[PDB]
Design a protein around this ligand. Structure first.
Ligand SMILES: O=C(O)[C@@H]1O[C@@H](O[C@H]2[C@H](O)[C@H](O)[C@H](O[C@H]3[C@H](O)[C@H](O)[C@H](O[C@H]4[C@H](O)[C@H](O)[C@H](O)O[C@H]4C(=O)O)O[C@H]3C(=O)O)O[C@H]2C(=O)O)[C@@H](O)[C@@H](O)[C@@H]1O
Length: 498
């Protein structure tokens, strides 16, 4: 039952083999060199099968061949340590069953740079791959370097059935580096665990905290320069546990993406529609389990669809680092810095309103969500933005969300009705908000901004440990918890080192 879920349950499956790292032999400098030549002399259609063992410091491994598979002889038993980057330049390259641990990326765009079309990373495990690369506050501004683990630069990439555990230095774990056309990447059925910041005193440098405490996402799809183009990528059916990197768990920074059906458990980080248009966030199960600074989804930009999510037991309103508009709750409609009600846009040529700034939300559909025991439920934004991560001046000119349509949502704080189910604010009234058959039980601040809603719960049943509200809220038929029965590789590792 929902409240009783824990990591052990989420991570258990009888399908999983144990791979003992202690039973693996360390390849010699000679054997590593030989493995390396094999990689680089591949012909199209070939396979490289890596004998069980631990292989230190492969370094820069460039794959130019098409239609090749690089795989462990036994899944999980080819451990790649020290510095390594697979740079996948050919099309239709598959990496399969690899382990990256006790080492770090040889170049900052990750252990795996998926640059061709149809590249795949599957059944693989990253375990605390935070080591061996220089990691210092820089001379210019005391900024620590961002190192990713996987990056996607081509088309039709798939990152499926992997485990990405313990990313604990700065940098997004997966980055999509796209161009002007749709990418159609699939990031699905992965396990993400234990990302967290400030494990190496990065935050001790107080003047640099706004940026040093930023760029710890689990995934970033697109970026500010590319954000006004469609990616059409999918982040679906993933299991995320104790992912606490930063304010954004997932940063969507491009258009037409799907972020749906993921289970997000005790993660102090929000799905963030940061830049770009027309993104859809549906059927996710966000189970905060009462952990501080958990939350659902925060929203900038236009045309998004947020429907049928189940967001439960979340806590906390204000992130610890200031000036980053870090306002949390179940669903947060951010302020931005442009007058969208009069058609204003962000624009790379307009000083102060560049594409990396804050697009006031507009034309948002928020329907059939169930928010259960959320300390801050639907939060209408009031943040004051800074000019940039590096300029701490406050922007004068802050606007509220526009044309926000709420329908059939249920915010059920019947357990602790002192919790704020809907946080409206006369400081920033929404413009053209509509309310259709909303149900809000618990505190509603500035309720006179809201035309109508019901304060009486429909009939409530429990189906599969979820609340089902008769005729309203998230349809529980569309919802299920992702566990290691479908997510992650088909093995677990023993005798690893952080
Ligand atoms: O969430 C907020 O309310 C808000 O978020 C912060 O803004 C966004 C902006 O896009 C900002 O520029 C910044 O993104 C940078 C950053 O450097 C990030 O790591 C990423 O870098 C990518 C990108 O492809 C780059 O071109 C690059 O060379 O490296 C990549 C990398 O992964 O290293 O994207 C760039 C960028 O595209 O501009 O942070 C963003 C974010 O965190 O969501 C900021 O306004 C913050 O104060 C505020 O909290």
């Amino acid at each position: 039952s929902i409240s009783e879920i824990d990591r052990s349950y989420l991570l258990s499956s009888d399908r999983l083999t144990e791979v003992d790292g202690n039973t693996l032999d360390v390849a010699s400098e000679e054997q590593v060199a030989a493995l390396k030549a094999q990689f680089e002399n591949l012909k199209d259609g070939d396979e490289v099968v890596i004998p069980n063992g631990k292989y230190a410091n492969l370094g820069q491994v460039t794959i130019t061949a098409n239609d090749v598979t690089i795989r462990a002889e036994q899944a999980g038993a080819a451990w790649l340590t020290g510095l390594i980057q697979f740079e996948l330049k050919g099309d239709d390259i598959t990496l399969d069953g690899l382990v990256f641990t006790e080492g770090g990326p040889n170049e900052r765009f990750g252990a795996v740079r998926m640059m061709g079309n149809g590249n795949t990373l599957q059944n693989s495990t990253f375990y605390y791959f935070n080591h061996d690369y220089t990691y210092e506050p820089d001379e210019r501004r005391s900024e620590y370097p961002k190192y990713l683990w996987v990056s996607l630069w081509g088309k039709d990439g798939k990152v499926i059935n992997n485990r990405f555990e313990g990313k604990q230095k700065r940098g997004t774990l997966i980055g999509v580096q796209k161009d002007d056309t749709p990418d159609n990447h699939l990031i699905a059925n992965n396990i993400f665990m234990d990302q967290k910041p400030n494990q190496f005193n990065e935050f001790d440098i107080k003047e640099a905290i706004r940026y040093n405490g930023n760029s710890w996402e689990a995934i970033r799809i697109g970026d500010s320069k590319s954000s006004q183009w469609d990616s059409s990528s999918k982040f679906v059916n993933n299991l995320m546990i104790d992912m606490d990197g930063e304010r954004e768990l997932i940063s969507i920074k491009s258009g037409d993406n799907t972020i749906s059906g993921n289970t997000i458990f005790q993660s102090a980080a929000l799905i963030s529609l940061r830049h770009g248009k027309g993104n859809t966030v549906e059927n996710n199960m966000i189970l905060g389990n009462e952990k501080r600074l958990t939350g659902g989804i925060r929203i900038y930009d236009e045309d998004h669809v947020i429907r049928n999510n189940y967001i439960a037991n979340t806590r906390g309103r204000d992130g610890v680092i200031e000036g980053n508009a870090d306002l949390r709750g179940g669903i947060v409609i951010n302020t931005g810095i442009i007058d969208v009600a009069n058609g204003e846009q962000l624009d790379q040529s307009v000083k102060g309103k560049e594409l990396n700034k804050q697009w006031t939300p507009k034309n948002i559909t928020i329907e059939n969500n169930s928010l259960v025991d959320t300390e801050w439920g639907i939060v209408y934004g009031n943040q004051s933005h800074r000019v940039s991560l590096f300029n701490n001046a406050e922007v004068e000119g802050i606007y509220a969300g526009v044309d926000i349509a709420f329908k059939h949502n249920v915010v059920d704080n019947s357990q602790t009705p002192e919790f704020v189910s809907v946080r409206a604010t006369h400081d920033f009234p929404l413009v053209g908000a509509t309310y259709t058959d909303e149900t809000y039980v618990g505190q509603v601040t500035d309720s006179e901004l809201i035309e109508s809603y019901s304060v009486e719960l429909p009939k409530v049943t429990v189906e599969n440990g979820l609340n089902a509200y008769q005729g309203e809220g998230a349809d529980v038929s569309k919802l299920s918890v992702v566990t290691a029965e479908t997510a992650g590789p088909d093995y677990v590792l023993e005798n690893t080192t952080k």
